[PDB]
C-alpha cells in the first residue's frame, strides 16, 4: 500500500468517526476527529499538491473546517 492510499484511508477513518459522533450529538468528539482528518488531508496536500486529487482534499478540508466552526459554538 502506497503512502497516498494509506493516508487517504487514515483520513477516511477519522472523517467517518467525526460524522458518526456529529450525528450522535457529541460536538467535542466530532471536532477532534474532523481536526484529525484535516491534518491528514493537509499532509496529503503537501505530498501531492499538484495532482488531480488535491482539489478533493482541499474541498474536504474546508467542509470539515466549516463544520468545526459550527460545532464549536455549541459547547
Amino acid at each position: 500500500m502506497s503512502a497516498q492510499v494509506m493516508l487517504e484511508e487514515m483520513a477516511r477513518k477519522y472523517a467517518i468517526n467525526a460524522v458518526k459522533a456529529d450525528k450522535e450529538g457529541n460536538a467535542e468528539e466530532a471536532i477532534t476527529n474532523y481536526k484529525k482528518a484535516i491534518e491528514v488531508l493537509a499532509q496529503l496536500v503537501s505530498l501531492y499538491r499538484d495532482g488531480s486529487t488535491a482539489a478533493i482534499y482541499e474541498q474536504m478540508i474546508n467542509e470539515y473546517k466549516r463544520r468545526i466552526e459550527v460545532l464549536k459554538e455549541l459547547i
Partner: peptide, 11 residues
C-alpha cells in the same frame, strides 16, 4: 483521480 469511496460530507 477521485476518492472511491467518497469522503463523507458533514451533517
Amino acid at each position: 483521480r477521485e476518492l472511491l469511496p467518497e469522503l463523507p460530507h458533514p451533517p
